[PDB]
Amino acid sequence: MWELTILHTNDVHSRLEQTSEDSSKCVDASRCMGGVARLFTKVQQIRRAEPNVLLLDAGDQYQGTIWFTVYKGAEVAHFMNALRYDAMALGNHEFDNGVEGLIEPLLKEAKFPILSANIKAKSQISGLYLPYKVLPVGDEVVGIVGYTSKETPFLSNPGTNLVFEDEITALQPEVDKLKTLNVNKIIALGHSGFEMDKLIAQKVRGVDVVVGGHSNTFLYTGNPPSKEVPAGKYPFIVTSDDGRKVPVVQAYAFGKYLGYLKIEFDERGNVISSHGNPILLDSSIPEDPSIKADINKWRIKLDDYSTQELGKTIVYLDGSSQSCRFRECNMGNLICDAMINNNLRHADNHVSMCILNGGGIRSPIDERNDGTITWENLAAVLPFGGTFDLVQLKGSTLKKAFEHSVHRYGQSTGEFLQVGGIHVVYDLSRKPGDRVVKLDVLCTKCRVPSYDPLKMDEVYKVILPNFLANGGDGFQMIKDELLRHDSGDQDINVVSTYISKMKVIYPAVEGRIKFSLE
């Protein structure tokens, strides 16, 4: 028997410092979690105890906090090198600052192999990322094959030169080449989501284990340690088409947990068994002093975004995925109110309605730090540098959008819409495409605004992110059927301006989105 311990992270999203339990800024240090200093301590503890260890990342280190807005990936390469990661797979967010934003900060400075077998460039990038790497682990070798979401061209900015192939089609020839080289232990490490990960495990002959990301999937065996509810056991077992039991793992997001899987291999590289669980990186684990002092050094340049108080909140600003992708969330209401307020000011075409993809809200903000709101706090909520555009839509188009908002409800997908100037009621007992039971909107062609049923043949002006106006999140009907599209102001500046104007904010959940009982 040859035992291998796989340590893994995914969707860290620039949470270099320890955070609050909800992955927002750490205020109460006594109860904070995650961060690269704490992760280091745990990884070192495991490396001291286990002789065959691999520390892997399944992508999306890029984007999420002021660390990335300021260092643009230099902090990723630096701290991933300090933690001595053995390999990383490319995620979609590694392409947000173009191919140039991946090459210079990360690919040229990473001391570990960076992988993706399904990205074919059509050179300069040649060899800076690899389809696989064969890693020596003691007296054995372990092959790691990478993969990246085939949806990256739509989700990010990888440019016209990179081609993204079907993951299964691109992986099988690389795995087969590893098998011809007598590499009998193979890990598929990549960034496509738990559903594709299970398909890779079922269909790619020769893959012994799948380490994934992108869906922020939390898996656990037994009673879980924090607020994340498990989507399945850890590992999730897939029975492959050739009859092998293949463990599939993921470790939520934001560096809150360290994925930990122990695999028992025979002499021919068959998985005899495996077990483990994600480790909660809570205050019980001390932050490594050396890494922490280096974090404090890099932190000095960021304190310019933490000194200006933009305003104050007397309520918890719920920007969590568990709220904003499933129901009305007060952060969504705040952002839509700021969006509506911004246009109802610098017009010289006035608008009363707002739609906002819940997945575009990427962090909550806590009210306990004397309720202070800084640019840094807002940078984690809106880390993409998008704009809030004005569009003219038909009622029929809006109805289709709201049907699309709940067409596959319950999967924590980002299309669920937050709103302003709209009162929507859904009936999830109904069939996809027929779940909107009520859709009232704030009249524009009226002297006193009031809510009236949306009319399919009428025309409404809606403020929304450029992501939705360009057909993102499957909102193809907006891009195809829109009658007008005007570019707007930068997302973060619109919310920043609105908070400074209000001074004290208290957004509520007030019935803009409801669910019927049937």
Ligand X SMILES: Nc1nc(=O)[nH]c2c1ncn2[C@@H]1O[C@H](COP(=O)(O)CP(=O)(O)O)[C@@H](O)[C@H]1O
- Binding-site sequence positions for AMP: 325, 357, 362, 384, 467, 473
Q: Which of 5, 61, 92, 330 binds Zn ion (CB under 5 A)?
A: 92
The pattern of x and - marking residues 48 through 87 that bind Zn ion according to CB under 5 A reads: ------------x---------------------------
Number of amino acids touching Zn ion (CB under 5 A): 5
Identity of the residue, 22 or 167, whose beta carbon is nearer to a copy of itself in the bound complex:
22
Neighbouring C-beta atoms of residue 494, cutoff 10 Å: 21
> What DSSP string runs through 84-124?
T-SEEE--GGGGTTTTHHHIIIIITT-SS-EE-SSEEE---
> What's the burial of 462, exposed, middle or buried (CB within 10 Å: 0-12/13-18/19+)?
buried
CB of 504 to a copy of itself, least distance (A): 5
CB of 393 to a copy of itself, least distance (A): 20
C-beta of residue 60 within 8 angstroms of C-beta of residue 214 = yes
Alpha carbon 326 to chain centroid distance? 16
Name the nearest CA neighbour of 75 among 146, 11, 15: 15
Question: Is the torsion defined by CA of 255, 67, 36, 227 positive or negative?
Answer: negative
- HSE, side-chain direction, 13 A CA sphere, residue 484: 11
Identity of the residue, 60 or 318, whose beta carbon is nearer to a copy of itself in the bound complex:
318
- What does the alpha-carbon distance between residue 363 and residue 380 come to, in Å, rounded to a whole number? 6
The pattern of x and - marking residues 165 through 204 that bind ligand X according to CB under 6 A reads: ----------------------------------------
C-beta of residue 238 within 8 angstroms of C-beta of residue 209 = no
Name the nearest CA neighbour of 12 among 38, 31, 41, 47: 38
- What does the alpha-carbon distance between residue 116 and residue 99 come to, in Å, rounded to a whole number? 14
CB crowding 202-220: b at 16 or more within 10 Å, else e: bbbebbbbbbbbbbbbbbb
The footprint of ligand X on residues 78-107 (CB under 6 A) is: 92-93
Question: Does the protein bind ligand X through residue 60 (CB under 6 A)?
Answer: yes
- What does the alpha-carbon distance between residue 159 and residue 7 come to, in Å, rounded to a whole number? 32
Question: Does the protein bind ligand X through residue 473 (CB under 6 A)?
Answer: yes
Identity of the residue, 219 or 353, whose beta carbon is nearer to a copy of itself in the bound complex:
353
Positions that interact with a copy of itself (CB under 8 A):
314-316, 318, 330, 344-345, 350, 352, 367, 421, 423, 442, 447-451, 501-504, 506-511
C-beta of residue 99 within 8 angstroms of C-beta of residue 158 = yes
Residue 360 binding partner per list ligand X, a copy of itself, Zn ion, none, with a CB distance cut-off of 5 to 8 Å that depends on partner kind = ligand X
Identity of the residue, 19 or 333, whose beta carbon is nearer to Zn ion in the bound complex:
19
Identity of the residue, 149 or 352, whose beta carbon is nearer to Zn ion in the bound complex:
149
CB of 152 to ligand X, least distance (A): 9
Alpha helices in 182-258 (DSSP H): 194-203
CB of 302 to ligand X, least distance (A): 22
User: What angle (nearest 5°) sits at the alpha carbon of residue 41, between those of residues 40 and 42?
Assistant: 90
Residue 451 binding partner per list ligand X, a copy of itself, Zn ion, none, with a CB distance cut-off of 5 to 8 Å that depends on partner kind = a copy of itself
The pattern of x and - marking residues 277 through 306 that bind ligand X according to CB under 6 A reads: ------------------------------
Q: Which of 269, 386, 420, 421 binds ligand X (CB under 6 A)?
A: 386
Question: Does the protein bind Zn ion through residue 214 (CB under 5 A)?
Answer: yes
Q: Which of 4, 6, 9, 11 binds Zn ion (CB under 5 A)?
A: 11
- 3-state DSSP call for residue 291? helix
Residues in the chain: 518
- Sequence letter at residue 345: R
Stretch that binds Zn ion, among 30-38, 212-220, 292-300, 372-380 (CB under 5 A): 212-220
- What does the alpha-carbon distance between residue 325 and residue 5 come to, in Å, rounded to a whole number? 34
> What's the burial of 138, exposed, middle or buried (CB within 10 Å: 0-12/13-18/19+)?
exposed
Q: Which of 158, 360, 371, 488 binds ligand X (CB under 6 A)?
A: 360
Identity of the residue, 357 or 397, whose beta carbon is nearer to ligand X in the bound complex:
357
Residue 314 binding partner per list ligand X, Zn ion, a copy of itself, none, with a CB distance cut-off of 5 to 8 Å that depends on partner kind = a copy of itself
CB of 464 to ligand X, least distance (A): 9
Question: Does the protein bind ligand X through residue 357 (CB under 6 A)?
Answer: yes
Identity of the residue, 142 or 424, whose beta carbon is nearer to a copy of itself in the bound complex:
424
Identity of the residue, 105 or 488, whose beta carbon is nearer to Zn ion in the bound complex:
105
Residue of this chain nearest to ligand X (CB atom): 414
- What does the alpha-carbon distance between residue 374 and residue 496 come to, in Å, rounded to a whole number? 9
What are the residues binding ligand X (CB under 6 A)? 11, 60, 92-93, 155, 214, 216, 357, 359-360, 384, 386, 413-414, 465, 467, 473
